[PDB]
Ligand binder design. Structure first.
Ligand SMILES: [Ca+2]
Ligand SMILES: [Ca+2]
Ligand SMILES: [Ca+2]
Ligand SMILES: [Ca+2]
Lengths: 116, 116
């Protein structure tokens, strides 16, 4: 399923937002983080992350985990372009390859639970 | 709740029309825009629109409003796949996802008045 954030904000406002992020906070990467449609995990009110460009996928996940409040016993996965991410990857490599035209990196997250 | 335009125009004349418009006008999306069945709003002679690719839904709705002659206080809604489009959606995104087999995006519109 498509991004609920993309849908509810105009491209021009999204593009200007992402560019104002990387100008005011040049050390950061503008990230949109939304729940995988399928999963039993809670949606974030504030799905925009200004992520230190020195983070690995694994570190951003730890940061994301603090917000979703998922039981630490449960795994948390993240996705760009419909493919799960290895925690070893550098957020800043994921950003440059997979960034949207508006300048945001759109990510999905899921725990281990799914509906069907 | 089906398309009058589709009934009165041939499939391969439609497909050929959409690609002709697309080649003559590269930055414009081919839209068929028809009234919701039960709405009190006027059809629309005149239902093909060559929409600038960068228009939001709300900018397209401003264009349609002038043509349909709906009072300012009165709301105007557009639909595709049978669901209301948000004003912040991009016509390019809606086109990409929802375009017909024949290459037109088929939309419907209504004001707030309906027949019981
Ligand atoms: Ca939150
Ligand atoms: Ca053009
Ligand atoms: Ca007309
Ligand atoms: Ca656009």
């Amino acid at each position: 399923k498509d991004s609920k954030y993309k849908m509810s904000h105009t491209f021009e406002s999204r593009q200007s937002d992402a560019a104002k992020v990387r100008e005011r906070h040049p050390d950061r990467l503008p990230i949109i983080c939304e729940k995988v449609y399928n999963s039993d995990i809670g949606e974030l009110d504030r799905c925009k992350f200004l992520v230190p460009s020195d983070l690995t996928v694994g570190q951003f996940v730890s940061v994301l985990r603090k917000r979703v409040q998922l039981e630490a016993e449960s795994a948390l996965f993240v996705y760009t372009n419909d493919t799960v991410l290895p925690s070893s990857a550098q957020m800043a490599d994921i950003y440059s390859k997979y960034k949207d035209e508006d300048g945001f990196l759109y990510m999905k997250y899921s725990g281990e639970a799914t509906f069907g």
